[PDB]
Amino acid sequence: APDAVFGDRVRRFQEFLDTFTSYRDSVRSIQVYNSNNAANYNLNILPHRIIISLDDLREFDRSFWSGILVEPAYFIPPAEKALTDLADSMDDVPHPNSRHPWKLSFKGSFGAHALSPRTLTAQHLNKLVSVEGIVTKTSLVRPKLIRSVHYAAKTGRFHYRDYTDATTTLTTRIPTPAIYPTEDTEGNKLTTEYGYSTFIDHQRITVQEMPEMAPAGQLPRSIDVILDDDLVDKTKPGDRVNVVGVFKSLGAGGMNQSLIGFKTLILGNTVYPLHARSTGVAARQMLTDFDIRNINKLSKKKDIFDILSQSLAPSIYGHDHIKKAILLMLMGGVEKNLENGSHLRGDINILMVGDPSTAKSQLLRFVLNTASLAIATTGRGSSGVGLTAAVTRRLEAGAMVLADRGVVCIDEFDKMTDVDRVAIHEVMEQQTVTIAKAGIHTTLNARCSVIAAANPVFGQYDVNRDPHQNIALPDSLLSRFDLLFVVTDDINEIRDRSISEHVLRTHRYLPPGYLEGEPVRERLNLSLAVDHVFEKFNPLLIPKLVTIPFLRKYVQYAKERVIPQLTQEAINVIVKNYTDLRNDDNTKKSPITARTLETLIRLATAHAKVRLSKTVNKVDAKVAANLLRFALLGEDI
Amino acid sequence: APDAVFGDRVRRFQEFLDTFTSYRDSVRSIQVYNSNNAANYNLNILPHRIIISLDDLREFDRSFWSGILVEPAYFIPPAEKALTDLADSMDDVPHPNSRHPWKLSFKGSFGAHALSPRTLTAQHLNKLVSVEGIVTKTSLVRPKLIRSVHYAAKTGRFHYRDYTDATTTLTTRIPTPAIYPTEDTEGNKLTTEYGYSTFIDHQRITVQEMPEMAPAGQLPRSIDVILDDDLVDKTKPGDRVNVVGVFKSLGAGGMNQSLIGFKTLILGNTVYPLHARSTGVAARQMLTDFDIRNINKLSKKKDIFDILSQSLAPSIYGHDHIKKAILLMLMGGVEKNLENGSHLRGDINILMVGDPSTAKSQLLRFVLNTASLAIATTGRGSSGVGLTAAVTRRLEAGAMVLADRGVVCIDEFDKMTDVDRVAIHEVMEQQTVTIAKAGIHTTLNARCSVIAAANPVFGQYDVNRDPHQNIALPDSLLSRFDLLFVVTDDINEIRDRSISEHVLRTHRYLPPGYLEGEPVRERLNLSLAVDHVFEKFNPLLIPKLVTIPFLRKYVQYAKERVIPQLTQEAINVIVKNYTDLRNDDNTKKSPITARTLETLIRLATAHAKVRLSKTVNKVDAKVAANLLRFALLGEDI
Amino acid sequence: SAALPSIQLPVDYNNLFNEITDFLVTFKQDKGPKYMAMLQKVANRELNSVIIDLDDILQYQNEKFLQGTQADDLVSAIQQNANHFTELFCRAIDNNMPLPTKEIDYKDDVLDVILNQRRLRNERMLSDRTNEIRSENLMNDALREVVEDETELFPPNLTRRYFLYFKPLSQNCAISSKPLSVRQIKGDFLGQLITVRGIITRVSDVKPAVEVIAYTCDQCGYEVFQEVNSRTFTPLSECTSEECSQNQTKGQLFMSTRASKFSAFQECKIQELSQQVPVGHIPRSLNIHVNGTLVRSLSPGDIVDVTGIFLPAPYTGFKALKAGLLTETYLEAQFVRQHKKKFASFSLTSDVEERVMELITSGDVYNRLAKSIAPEIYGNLDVKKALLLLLVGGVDKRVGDGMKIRGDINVCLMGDPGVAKSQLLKAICKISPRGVYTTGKGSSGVGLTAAVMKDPVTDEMILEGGALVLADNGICCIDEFDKMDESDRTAIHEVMEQQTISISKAGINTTLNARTSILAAANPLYGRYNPRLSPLDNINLPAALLSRFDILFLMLDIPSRDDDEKLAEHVTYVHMHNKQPDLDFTPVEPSKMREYIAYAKTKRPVMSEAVNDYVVQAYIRLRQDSKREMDSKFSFGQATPRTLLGIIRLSQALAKLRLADMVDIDDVEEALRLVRVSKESLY
Ligand SMILES: Nc1ncnc2c1ncn2[C@@H]1O[C@H](COP(=O)(O)OP(=O)(O)O)[C@@H](O)[C@H]1O
Ligand SMILES: Nc1ncnc2c1ncn2[C@@H]1O[C@H](COP(=O)(O)OP(=O)(O)O)[C@@H](O)[C@H]1O
Ligand SMILES: Nc1ncnc2c1ncn2[C@@H]1O[C@H](COP(=O)(O)OP(=O)(O)O)[C@@H](O)[C@H]1O
Ligand SMILES: [Mg+2]
Ligand SMILES: [Mg+2]
Ligand SMILES: [Mg+2]
Ligand SMILES: [Zn+2]
16 A cells, blocks of 8 residues: 655655756666667676765755665665656666666765674664675575466466565565465466576675774674675675675564574675775776876876886885886786687796895785785795685685785795695696695686795895805796896995985875874775876985876776787897897896796786787887896896 | 456456447546536536446457356456546546546346346356345445544654455455554554545345245245445335346355354345336336427327327226326326425325226226336225334335325225225325324325225115215315216117227237237336337227327326426416306215315316426316316216 | 466467477478487387487478468577476377387386386276276267276376487577576576586486386275475375275375386586686586486586576575575586597597598698697697607507506606696696696695595495596696605506505595506706706606606707797797697697597507517617616616506507507507607707
8 A cells, every 4th residue: 555655755765866867877878788788689787776875865855864874664665666767767768578676775974874793783773784894604696486487287377476575675564475386276287487487696695894803812793694686796705895785683583482582684785895905806996088098198108117117116215127027017918818728827927035124025015005906925824725725515715816817925935835835836837726625626717926025045145156046946936937036235325325315205204184293094995896197205306206096097907908919020029038048148047948938928018018009019028128137137238 | 466367358348348439438428427517516426337238248258248247256357447447548637636446337138147036046156146126124324434544643644544345346355354543553642534534335235036926925035235335225125126246155154163154145236226016116217309309299289188198098998087187197286385384285186986897997007007106005905004104113114105206096995994094184185194103203205196996885876866975985085086086887878889899809909929819928017217109009990099108208208397387377267167166056076175276276287287388378277177077067068 | 366366478388389299290301300210219219318409499490481481489488498398398299109110028128118018008998998988878089088087097207218308509500508607597597498518526326316106005906106396205105096085995005116207316516617717706516417318428527518407496505594485506407518528439420530531631640640739839749749649548458367457658747947848738638538637735635536425415425536536547637746745656656557546544445446647747856957967866756656657758948049949939929829830730629639539549459470579679679778877877767567568558559540450660660769759858
């Protein structure tokens, strides 16, 4: 039976949708997208879901906003009905072959409802809450029968029955346990018609307080979240997540005479995978047309490589070719997948062996902070079980499996066991992890670029000795590292005063919105995995330095929209340089193998990607070989 | 949940309604009528009900027809939904201030489903049956709460609840005993808002086998009929009725463990009051424009009175002025209701005293058969309890109360007790029955015209004696009779042979569709209380004779659309004739009182009604006084 | 009516059944109708499986359209709802089932004679009703129609001997055949006929799953059949036949296993391929329900396209976690396509023959096949020749005393870093239908063994094999051979000599069969070859592990000007265009190489006196040469009787590659040449 208050709220939300035109634009775009590939194929179908900004709702109608936040069961169904009515009103051109219920998702500032699994108590029940946590368990995506269609052969007629549970609606119904129809009303045997029955995907994930904010030494708190038909498979275990949903109570909690307390869970409305450092979530960024224009504008510059090289770690003094190599690894080459099935690696590995305090770990931490997807590990702090996969009858991804299509920053690389070393041997060239353990023969993808830091045998790189004795690493392992940089802390007066002036200038830095003696606050930077190009603060005083967010945008653009093709004019340089490096006797820091030809190719491709060029020209090969010759010998030609 | 078969039947009945345009015409006429007096008064509102001819449905779709007749619960709801959809489709102009459910009523040939309460067995259950019987009990028209509207003062909000029972739908629901809401969901006290709640009239009548067709000496069979919101008060106890409805079974019949058998009754869809002779149901007749044209055409004739007089009882020979008086009584005068409250009678009473076999009873039986509403009684066969009202704490109408606005044919008037005679004294002039018995002081209306037949004291009217000694009736009683006709069986050779030739010609009669030696069949003529003018069979061989149905149509038209006004040119004749009759010494058959002035006035008005004239002219008064002088003396001037 | 409402679907099953019957009777484009030929074969009991091609139905519909007749889309209806059309096609085949032209004899299956008996019994009961009613004397159409109302016959599913399967319509000959990942199979695809591409990870034993359990009643002499639909069933206790139900003294009815209907049941587990798993995700598995004659067509490690009806199953998880009518899902397998056809299932059909002649007539089969093994790897021709010989393998010899000789070639590639030993291992794994790539000191400690567990489907203790067991009758490519545990090395020793793994541990005492060819890749002592040090010194293989390998290559990376120039041109061309540089030489497609090698493995060449005399002389000379250099800085470990059998195995493999039955002098020449050049990179 119709409710006057329900209709009043429906028309109020219709007024809200009319006021903010972005929601008709979103619904219209979704409908035209669905119709266009429906007619095209007689890709994927976008869900009937709209992101609603709670700030705009508060601006429009504060009580509707407070009603949704505090009494969602009475305000969300009317708003969803209004959205569905609006969508069916604009649906003048129906999809080929009210109706099509549209769901709502919420975003914005939740205030006191933005909680965690620890702070989510029983006085938040029946409220729209945003819970931030870590996904620890993801159940199987199971179909749920919401409508069963049967066939009666004697009458030749198709019947159906709709099913309802306590979690499909925000309000409580009268429970109607309608049985599965095994026969008609008048005795005819029914045959279930699979493919005409309706099954809805259902998942139940567990969100636990994030380790970065959970109290140390205390047992963590968890909360159940239920996802239905479009939020399933939106996250994976170990993901940082922000789930917006209604904190519901279900069952009777032992009152109904046939539990210790009422069964509580979150009916998920929105799932946002969050980006935290050293996690398995990549960093999607929004690239406006202005950002792309600036990226192309800077790519037109000749010295853009240098501009990108110095802007990586201005705080670190020097380490300029190391920064060039780090930028090239951030871009990386393009992997080759030949038709027969073979794989050519397109990821660049870097090793930095050096004396104490030459900033190898700060250069690792910077890469961890700025990379799209980076996992930080330490030698012997993570084993092969912790680096590669692990069998739990089920597999748990390790450091280098979560970092697939990403970067692995390994500090204290020398303090790594040989059992880990063999797994690392497999991961670096073939980019795969073969388990073959306890009846689980699986080949996980570990297409990751490894950057590592190491110390010499005696703790100080002796220039009198040779590198092979100063490294104490297997030669086969050192071959996998595309670029091996030996950094030595030479005491020279010019660079001594220059590095000290830099260190002090960096220490004498103030944020734009801070006082002289105000302790700088620090948050954990839980970015959402979806305004000037250059940097005001320049530790060096000189070319221009771009901001780290803009550098990340540039790296993302070049990494996702540029796939350079090798050219003969680059091949001549690459082949000549490889032949010289193989045959010339120079007492190289690292050996020269066919892997050296491919690090030449990969670095040339990466530098071509830096310039946004779709073809690797001669200059790219020359600069790649230049960096390689520096890395092998120390030349400055 | 929508049903495919339900929609298929809905669209099939929509096709049926489109094929037969009379149903859109009826629904459109009903809607425009409702809108027109809705806007007029910001009379009565026609119900949302349509008469459906089952013959047309059989012509269109025989299975839909058989489905309605045999499985009404599955075919009547879809047809009603189709009719409602059609009505709301034509409702381009809504009434001032789907919706408005339209009900269906059925008419036509039912075949094996046309039954009686005796022949209605348990194998007719869940079938659409037409049952003919007599109404013996009519329960109170009680409101039934179908929607209760309540007000919550704390929230200031109007709530409602709909109620459903087993008799409101042809199909069986799940029973939902929703309680009367005495409080809101959250504890606020509710106040019932009468005048906004919805109450539907409900009546339960009992239909018993008609005495004319029930077996003699056997206990009669009865059936319950339930009428809802427009069929209530369509009949009264004692009425012959034809109820079309679904023979439903209700309850569990003792199977549900908490009756000897299942509770069965008829859910009335249609109620037709039937016209049977000597019953309380008048005879509505359909007057087409052709019938009215013929009536006016004949009324233009000068001798139409004679044409109507001879066509009454052609089978009876002679009795011509008696037939004129009978026709005038069938028309009758116009009653006067003065402002102070007094009443002047407009009904003509006739008494026929005569010798054995002068057709007094055949002239009574003819009036019983041809009158719009006539009740036949015999002296001492019905007492004052049987003639006037009777107290049962409730009143039961007698012979002269059921015959209100009708005719009472009393045979053997002389064999009537004085206790009855006093009640008849009251009924004839004041046209009322005052009970004043057992705490019931009631004045029932008995505005009836009395025609009676009587025999002399010695069984043969002695012409030597005077009428006052030959009648042996109270003089005050004889004054009430407007026209007293003394008929004597004089043996005269001319009329002897003429009456014998007539009697034999009438006996030598054959119906148009009968053989020479075929026994004529005879039905009970259960006419429905809603093609030539003249008669082919003429016993006399002469003016033209009109058919009895056409004469009934003419009497109905003149009786319901003509109200003559007295004129001075008629008053002069009336006054002169009354003064002469009062003062002239002629040894009248009946006394002359002021009632004689009013029988002159009434007969003049009746003859004016015969000519369809709205004013009583001089000729009407002259012919009225002529008939009166014949009735008093025997003159032929 | 108000409850259980009716819905109007665009599917009419009567004319769909009529179209099915018309297609079965009239389709002949693949001397007469293809399907009645198949039903005639089934009637005579040469075939127990009916595979309905969706390509055939699509072609029939296309032909009907071309001639003007409007035909309902049977293919789309089957794809959308496949469970009903198995039921439909079975009824249609039963209607058009030809009479058998072969009588029942004593060599037929017990199921066949049971079905014949019940068919004759039901026809006799029909005739008996007919005769009784004729004797009662109360048109033959009405008489018959009374008879089938008063008969309790055996239903058609009990007189049914074949199994029905739906082969998906080919992509080239085109929804049901486009391969889907396990993730891509959502609940929208439930009830449809879909194809999933994956790798099989666990196959259960073929068990008898009851479908219609039969009982016999000793009171009325009836056979009461109860259908089974779920995981568990409740047996009948009292008879439910007409006689006992009408009577008051019911009969207690006993199971009849021979009269019950059983199905060969397997529950396989398919898994996502590495190319299908998204970034940072763990592959998820899907349950495949294999029934009927289709069993034993899936084995662990198979990369297959499995086409089947995606069907729901009752929930089996925790009850407290059930929110609604949650259902488990499985794939009722109907068809299996093997990406890598097994060498055992090779048949010399016409198309296989034409391809092999087009390979042979091109000439130079040995060098073409060797150079086609990883064609982007450049300049390892002796290496690729030895790998091809390993793929072909020698000829297994069982001597009458019960002795067995291995017949399979183990090849060890010890080399410097960056020489493509690991790329050659994955090439061999790709070529081999049963190839297992493992890395030493990873997680293969249990891999080079089998682990005893419980089968979840069937209540048994079964030991699931690992790397050396899953690569049985195949190839195990072991990378980083010099870095395994001692137990793994001993297991490798046992596998390479006896082709078995003897396990005597707490809970197990078994001898696993591992008929595996071992292709090992190793790094020399110190990770780089020191030519100053002795070859045996730089080889970290026990004289007994080294002895087992039939060939041991020493792939050394010496710098050069022309050789490095040529490698760099090849690698850089491969990086420009995803193909090898050479235009004169076209590599053999790996599917056509597997077909040639499968054909070659069917030959068992023998050695004559004239060839084995030279084999003896060469063995003697090899032994003398090995004796003359025991520590001369070029010692490879002295020759052994194992080198003779390796020479013999290589000669037999080379003879097989020629598709010959005689081991000729050319093959022994090439075997000696390969053994000699296995070690010339040192010089
Ligand atoms: N070349 C350098 N330029 C700037 N800061 C430096 C440099 N070398 C060392 N530092 C500083 O030294 C500190 C320690 O460096 P760290 O990265 O921990 O050294 P290591 O690589 O030996 O672990 C940091 O605060 C870092 O900024
Ligand atoms: N004048 C008459 N004309 C025709 N029929 C007559 C006449 N008088 C008597 N009859 C016949 O006599 C029969 C008996 O008449 P009835 O009405 O019973 O007489 P009464 O009035 O004495 O009771 C009827 O069949 C009637 O037709
Ligand atoms: N002869 C060669 N031809 C082509 N590529 C080669 C050759 N030698 C080495 N490579 C390249 O060297 C890289 C590393 O070889 P890999 O097989 O991993 O080394 P190893 O076998 O020594 O462990 C591969 O990407 C491969 O393409
Ligand atoms: Mg450090
Ligand atoms: Mg009489
Ligand atoms: Mg390797
Ligand atoms: Zn029995």
